[PDB]
Structure formats: C-alpha cells, structure tokens
Enzyme design. Structure first.
Site, mmCIF file in Angstrom:
data_model
loop_
_atom_site.group_PDB
_atom_site.id
_atom_site.type_symbol
_atom_site.label_atom_id
_atom_site.label_comp_id
_atom_site.label_asym_id
_atom_site.label_seq_id
_atom_site.Cartn_x
_atom_site.Cartn_y
_atom_site.Cartn_z
ATOM 1 N N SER A 19 0.022 -5.060 3.919
ATOM 2 C CA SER A 19 -0.655 -6.201 3.309
ATOM 3 C C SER A 19 0.301 -7.195 2.659
ATOM 4 C CB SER A 19 -1.671 -5.724 2.269
ATOM 5 O OG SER A 19 -2.945 -5.504 2.855
ATOM 6 N N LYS A 31 0.460 -11.131 3.130
ATOM 7 C CA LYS A 31 -0.506 -12.113 2.651
ATOM 8 C C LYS A 31 0.105 -13.055 1.622
ATOM 9 C CE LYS A 31 -4.029 -8.806 3.795
ATOM 10 N NZ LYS A 31 -4.770 -7.581 3.347
ATOM 11 N N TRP A 41 -12.440 -3.667 3.512
ATOM 12 C CA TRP A 41 -11.756 -4.161 2.319
ATOM 13 C C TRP A 41 -11.660 -5.691 2.335
ATOM 14 C CZ3 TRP A 41 -11.108 -2.271 -2.312
ATOM 15 C CH2 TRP A 41 -10.275 -2.957 -3.203
ATOM 16 N N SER A 80 -5.858 -8.825 -1.911
ATOM 17 C CA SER A 80 -5.545 -8.351 -0.560
ATOM 18 C C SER A 80 -6.749 -8.438 0.372
ATOM 19 C CB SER A 80 -4.998 -6.924 -0.587
ATOM 20 O OG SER A 80 -4.339 -6.609 0.621
ATOM 21 N N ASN A 125 -9.088 -8.910 3.260
ATOM 22 C CA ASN A 125 -8.748 -8.884 4.680
ATOM 23 C C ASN A 125 -9.500 -9.940 5.484
ATOM 24 O OD1 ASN A 125 -6.742 -6.892 4.943
ATOM 25 N ND2 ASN A 125 -8.280 -5.274 4.707
ATOM 26 N N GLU A 133 -4.879 -4.226 12.606
ATOM 27 C CA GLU A 133 -3.970 -3.588 13.555
ATOM 28 C C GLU A 133 -2.531 -3.575 13.055
ATOM 29 O OE1 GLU A 133 -6.555 -5.412 14.831
ATOM 30 O OE2 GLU A 133 -7.515 -3.563 15.548
ATOM 31 N N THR A 177 1.592 -6.622 -3.188
ATOM 32 C CA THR A 177 1.782 -5.250 -2.746
ATOM 33 C C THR A 177 1.383 -5.094 -1.281
ATOM 34 O OG1 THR A 177 -0.400 -4.716 -3.633
ATOM 35 C CG2 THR A 177 1.494 -4.281 -5.042
ATOM 36 N N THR A 188 0.231 -1.562 1.469
ATOM 37 C CA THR A 188 -0.059 -0.125 1.526
ATOM 38 C C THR A 188 -0.615 0.204 2.914
ATOM 39 O OG1 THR A 188 -0.647 -0.280 -0.816
ATOM 40 C CG2 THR A 188 -1.108 1.795 0.303
HETATM 41 O O1 LIG Z 1 -2.079 -2.606 2.735
HETATM 42 C C1 LIG Z 1 -3.196 -2.314 2.458
HETATM 43 N N1 LIG Z 1 -3.749 -2.560 1.138
HETATM 44 C C2 LIG Z 1 -2.977 -3.181 0.086
HETATM 45 N N2 LIG Z 1 -1.899 -2.664 -0.510
HETATM 46 N N3 LIG Z 1 -1.466 -3.543 -1.435
HETATM 47 N N4 LIG Z 1 -2.284 -4.599 -1.411
HETATM 48 N N5 LIG Z 1 -3.223 -4.374 -0.465
HETATM 49 C C3 LIG Z 1 -4.122 -1.656 3.470
HETATM 50 C C4 LIG Z 1 -5.473 -1.466 3.241
HETATM 51 C C5 LIG Z 1 -5.994 -0.853 4.342
HETATM 52 C C6 LIG Z 1 -7.468 -0.485 4.441
HETATM 53 C C7 LIG Z 1 -7.882 0.797 4.126
HETATM 54 C C8 LIG Z 1 -9.225 1.128 4.199
HETATM 55 C C9 LIG Z 1 -10.151 0.168 4.573
HETATM 56 C C10 LIG Z 1 -9.735 -1.118 4.873
HETATM 57 C C11 LIG Z 1 -8.393 -1.448 4.799
HETATM 58 N N6 LIG Z 1 -5.012 -0.673 5.202
HETATM 59 C C12 LIG Z 1 -5.111 -0.043 6.511
HETATM 60 C C13 LIG Z 1 -5.795 -0.653 7.549
HETATM 61 C C14 LIG Z 1 -5.870 -0.035 8.790
HETATM 62 C C15 LIG Z 1 -5.262 1.191 8.999
HETATM 63 C C16 LIG Z 1 -4.571 1.802 7.966
HETATM 64 C C17 LIG Z 1 -4.500 1.184 6.726
HETATM 65 N N7 LIG Z 1 -3.837 -1.160 4.682
#
Ligand SMILES: O=C(Nc1nnn[nH]1)c1cc(-c2ccccc2)n(-c2ccccc2)n1
Length: 268
Positions: free
Chosen positions: A48, A51, A83, A108, A110, A146, A213, A215
């Site tokens: 993320s 962004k 999210w 964050s 989406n 993705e 951030t 994740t």
């Molecule tokens: O990076 C992220 N988040 C963040 N970190 N710091 N600021 N935002 C973040 C979030 C998500 C996520 C998780 C659950 C539902 C929807 C999205 N996936 C993600 C998406 C696809 C596959 C694996 C991970 N990656």
C-alpha cells in the site's frame, strides 16, 4: 557517509535475523547530509505504500489542471475494493479527487486508489510520474489488490528504500511539487492514521511526522516511509521495508520500529 552505515551493520543484521527475513533501510539527515544504508538498494514490494506517491502524482497533475482536486468522482458499488472504509461511506454520494487522495494516503483506501490510478492512466501513469522526478527504480505494475502478491524475486510493484527516500525527499522538501501542492502532500502524510506502531513509534514524542505504511501481509512484507521533523532541527527522511522467503511468514510492526530506531541511532 560509509562510516555510519558500518556502525549499524551488525545491529541491523541481528535484527533481521531475529525477524527471520530481510530488512531494507535508508535514511538521510538533511541537516548534515549523513546517510545510513542497509539493503537500501534491494527491491522490496511496495504494497500500500505506493498510495503516498499516487497522491503526490495527483498533486503534480493538479498544477496544469486547475480544479482537478475539486472534481467530483461518482462510482458504483462495483468500484468498491475490499478495505475501502472511506469510499464505501460515500458510495451513494461520491467524493472529490482531493478527498479520494487523502483517503488513499491516510486510510489506505483501496477503491479510492484504483479510482485515482485510473485518473493517471493506470500503474504505468504513476510509474511515468516517478521517472519524471528522477526515479528510475520505482515501478507499479498492477492494481489493488493484485500488487500485493510480494512474490520472492518478482520486480513487479517494487522499489528500493533508497529510491523511496530520495523521491519522498524530492516531493516533500525538494522541488518536484510546487509550494502549494508540496504542503498539501506533507499535510496528507502528517494526518496518516495507519502508522502509529512503525516509524511513529520510533521517534520522540515532540517530533512532527508524516508517513505512509504498507502491509502486503504475505511473505512477511510490510513497510513504512516518513519525513520526520525533529524539534528546531532539519528533517530526516527514511524508509524501512521488510520481506521474508515464505508466504506464511508474518510481518512485524515492532521490527519496523526497531529498524527506524537503529537508523536514527546511526545518524545521531
Ligand atoms: O498494504 C495493505 N494495507 C496497508 N498497510 N499500510 N497501509 N495500508 C494491504 C491491505 C490488504 C487487504 C487485506 C484484506 C482485505 C483487503 C485488503 N492487502 C492485501 C491485498 C491482497 C492480498 C494480500 C494483502 N494489503
């Protein structure tokens, strides 16, 4: 500044051994010019954390497109990506481009990210912007969600902690953005809500911090980059990225904070 990099080499290696993965850290003190590097040139998945640059890219486009930030953007239910805590609250109304950008940086969001990625011409459009400020390392290849695969050895949707830091410094302290747009980016980053346990947990209580951030989750992949303002002193720009060899390896916010401390320790 090869001296300070060597000072924290053994602590960084013990930290990433305790984490059981890789840790990429770059930090520059804009007051002296001292830098600390550890895997700072290796590629880590952006997750993320793209962004933040996505919002800066929207800000640069607002310069020659007046009223871009105020343009209302309406979107159906299918535009909702998992999210999207801010966007799904305006589903029946829509949001402005500046609102979508603040949601993508600070929460964050989406759905907001993909809507803005579409505004810039897709991942190639955001990559084009980073090349246009001198970043030859950054690359975005896919959309949410993705881009979060974090596959070992896959260069898609990756950058280096050094390139992230250098570009962050150009967009927050340098001249890549105009004075009006630069402050809005810093203001969006200062109001981030997802980073309390990473770089923010590593700086003194009186320091002003703007961060973004990331994740991916899988492969122990998480990150954080920030411009921190020590009281009455020049700001420090830093980036901390992690990954791990196994898909079910878990990321660590604590490890990210500890890496941010060791880099500040290296710079004083
Ligand atoms: O990076 C992220 N988040 C963040 N970190 N710091 N600021 N935002 C973040 C979030 C998500 C996520 C998780 C659950 C539902 C929807 C999205 N996936 C993600 C998406 C696809 C596959 C694996 C991970 N990656």
């Amino acid at each position: 500044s090869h001296m300070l990099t060597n000072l924290v080499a053994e602590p960084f290696a013990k930290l990433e051994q305790d984490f059981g993965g890789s840790i990429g850290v770059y930090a520059m003190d804009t007051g002296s010019g001292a830098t600390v590097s550890y895997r700072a040139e290796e590629r880590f998945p952006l997750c993320s954390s793209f962004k933040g640059f996505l919002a800066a890219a929207v800000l640069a486009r607002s310069q020659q497109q007046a009223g871009l930030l105020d343009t209302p953007i309406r979107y159906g239910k299918n535009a909702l990506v998992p999210w999207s805590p801010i966007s799904e609250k305006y589903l029946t109304t829509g949001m402005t481009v500046a609102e979508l950008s603040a949601a993508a940086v600070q929460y964050s969001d989406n759905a907001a990210a993909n809507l803005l990625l579409k505004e810039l011409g897709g991942p190639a459009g955001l990559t084009a912007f980073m090349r246009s400020i001198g970043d030859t390392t950054f690359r975005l290849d896919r959309w949410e969600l993705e881009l979060n695969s974090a596959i070992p050895g896959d260069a898609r949707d990756t950058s280096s902690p050094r390139a992230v830091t250098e570009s962050l410094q150009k967009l927050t302290l340098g001249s890549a953005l105009a004075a009006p747009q630069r402050q809005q980016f810093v203001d969006w980053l200062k109001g981030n809500t997802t980073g309390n346990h990473r770089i923010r947990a590593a700086v003194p209580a009186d320091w002003a911090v703007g961060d973004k951030t990331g994740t991916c989750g899988v492969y122990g992949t998480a990150n954080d980059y920030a411009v921190v303002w020590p009281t009455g002193r020049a700001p420090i720009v830093l980036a901390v990225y992690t990954r791990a060899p196994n898909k079910d390896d878990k990321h660590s916010e604590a490890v990210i904070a500890a890496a941010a401390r060791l880099a500040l320790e290296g710079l004083g």
